[PDB]
């Protein structure tokens, strides 16, 4: 009945906007198939819409951005209850979009997305291959569309008139190709190089005008903090990444979010990353920099506020380097190598932050 | 000297036959540039050499056998040495000079391959999939040409006449879609489904027209059998596995090379496995069968010369079911799910394996 839930799109435009040939400078046009399910698989679509968009500047006006008003709209003319979406769209996510779209899936324990992607966006970009990773963390299922996804699309949301869908050639060349682009940079770790240029905490000389930061989650279980291996991530930056983790997932309880980053906090992220743990009684919040960032500014009232709403804060020594190295970086086997003076500029540091953190005079 | 070494290719063709766009059906030339260098890396190319061929049947006269042939009368006239050796080939290798390349490489102690390659040559075909598998675990370091190796081909093979090589738009692009595609099939385990539909050992109703082979290595140190997880593998056929496992960068002693066969061997399988473990005083042969395939002639003698030749020779049951699924298959997390009368089925197919291997009655 999807058919008659859309007002369909026509051949000619499926086939020009879903052809999955990887690379396709010209298509700047964004078609996105939606289907809404409840949550068992028998039950037939609630509802079908196709959204359309273009792929260049203001992301507002972006499918995904229309599909979340249009969904936020739509879950309040029905009763509650949980919700397996699915998307078929021509380009993969933008990274406002992806940001977006993650965000929502984090905070929204009843709501489920599939998203079938013809065509990978600027899959060579590492801003896009993170933007992936985000959305595929929030709890997104990011697939290729393969022949049958193609066919049900076009069983579902085109106005084939009787007739079949019927393949391009390449389709499965270019489907094994995209494929594996996504697999890889959904499961791709830090560069070594990227990781000892960027965690070294010796004082800046050249480059890391970027902050790299590296997290792990843990619950509480019979007064013991056991690891949740599954939502690890890492992420580069030049709203807070605690928006995208969704802790509705995990095994309920308490949570304590380890956090290793390049750089301290600017005050914009310790303001955001305060805010966050003020609004969530449940999590914990534990960051280890390598080094100091002074902004120039308010950075020391950032971190001190981040302090009092009941974070911890520190600086990375040894330990954290080599946990780091041995968890986020594609290492190869290879051991962590640790720099001279690596503690010694551990310590300098710390007491630098000490003094920072520091309210009484003694 | 590489440029003096050799008759250099003119630009135009090195444009045409060097770009990476993945999909290229036309181009049914392939260019070898190959360079011999010593064990030393700082010492410069001893030989170099460009190799023509056409891609189509016929793959006598491939670049890379001919590439075999050159090289098997040019160390004859230089002393015996440790060589290294690079090719930058335009398409990767068909599935037969796959092999045979392969299968020198594994006999040869003295010689180290790294293969670059600009496109990927049938990369969706499963057959072809596994030939660049068989290269890689013979020990040849397989690669995708990125922007420097082109540029270095270019300084090295190409007459380009001082002119500095210029790259084509989407060279990095292209890259990133072939270098994911080379990474995911050379880490490529076997399907769930293919394994339960190949392994099962109910009698066969239908498919099963191909035998699926795993195999691992161990080796003998102070009479205990130790693994070597580097050098697994796992084959699909319609000469002989035991040829592409290179003995000889293992940790030298004696090994335990432990099959496990959806399909008990043809005659021709056994007689070249007996070949071989007759030959190779220092390897052991350890066949596990899930079916025995009645080839209508001469397999229950193959079978026998084969135990006659050292080899043993069983059935698989629950054990070994559960190690192949465990080790060779891409189970995403999730356990051996046994059929029903597994262990009835594997004890009567043992029963009929000791008739057939049963040499003196009692
Ligand atoms: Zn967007
Ligand atoms: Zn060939």
């Known amino acids: 009945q999807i058919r008659n839930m859309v007002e369909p799109m026509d051949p000619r435009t499926f086939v020009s906007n879903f052809n999955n040939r990887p690379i396709l400078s010209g298509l700047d046009t964004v078609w996105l198939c939606?289907?809404?399910?409840?949550?068992?698989?028998?039950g037939p679509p609630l509802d079908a819409k196709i959204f359309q968009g273009k792929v260049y500047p203001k992301a507002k006006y972006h499918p995904e951005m229309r599909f979340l008003r249009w969904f936020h709209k739509w879950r309040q003319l029905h009763h509650?209850?949980?919700?397996?979406?699915?998307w078929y769209v021509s380009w993969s996510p933008c990274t406002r979009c992806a940001n977006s779209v993650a965000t929502f899936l984090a905070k929204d324990p009843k709501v489920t997305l599939t998203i079938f992607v013809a065509r990978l966006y600027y899959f060579w970009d590492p801003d896009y291959q993170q933007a992936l990773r985000i959305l595929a963390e929030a709890g997104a299922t990011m697939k290729i569309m393969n022949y049958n996804e193609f066919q049900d699309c076009w069983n579902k949301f085109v106005d084939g008139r009787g007739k079949p869908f019927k393949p391009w050639n390449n389709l499965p060349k270019h489907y094994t190709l995209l494929q594996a682009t996504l697999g890889e940079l959904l499961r791709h770790l830090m560069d070594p190089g990227t990781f000892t240029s960027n965690f070294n905490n010796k004082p800046w000389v050249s480059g890391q005008h970027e902050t790299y930061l590296c997290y792990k989650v843990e619950r509480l279980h019979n007064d013991t903090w056991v690891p949740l291996n599954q939502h690890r991530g890492f992420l580069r930056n030049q709203l807070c990444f605690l928006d995208l983790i969704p802790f509705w997932?995990?095994?309920?309880?308490?949570?304590?979010?380890?956090?290793?980053?390049?750089?301290?906090?600017?005050?914009?992220?310790?303001?955001?990353?305060?805010?966050?743990?003020?609004?969530?009684?449940?999590?914990?919040?534990?960051?280890?920099?390598?080094?100091?960032?002074?902004?120039?500014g308010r950075y020391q009232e950032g971190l001190r506020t981040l302090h009092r709403d009941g974070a911890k804060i520190a600086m990375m020594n040894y330990s954290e380097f080599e946990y780091c190295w041995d968890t986020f970086v594609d290492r190869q086997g290879r051991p962590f190598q640790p720099w001279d003076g690596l503690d010694e500029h551990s310590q300098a540091l710390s007491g630098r932050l000490r003094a920072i953190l520091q309210n009484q005079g003694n």
């Open 249 to 296: 997932k995990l095994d309920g309880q308490q949570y304590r979010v380890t956090c290793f980053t390049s750089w301290s906090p600017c005050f914009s992220c310790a303001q955001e990353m305060a805010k966050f743990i003020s609004n969530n009684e449940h999590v914990s919040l534990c960051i280890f920099a390598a080094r100091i960032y002074d902004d120039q």
């Open 80 to 86: 509650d209850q949980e919700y397996k979406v699915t």
């Open 34 to 42: 939606c289907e809404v399910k409840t949550k068992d698989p028998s």
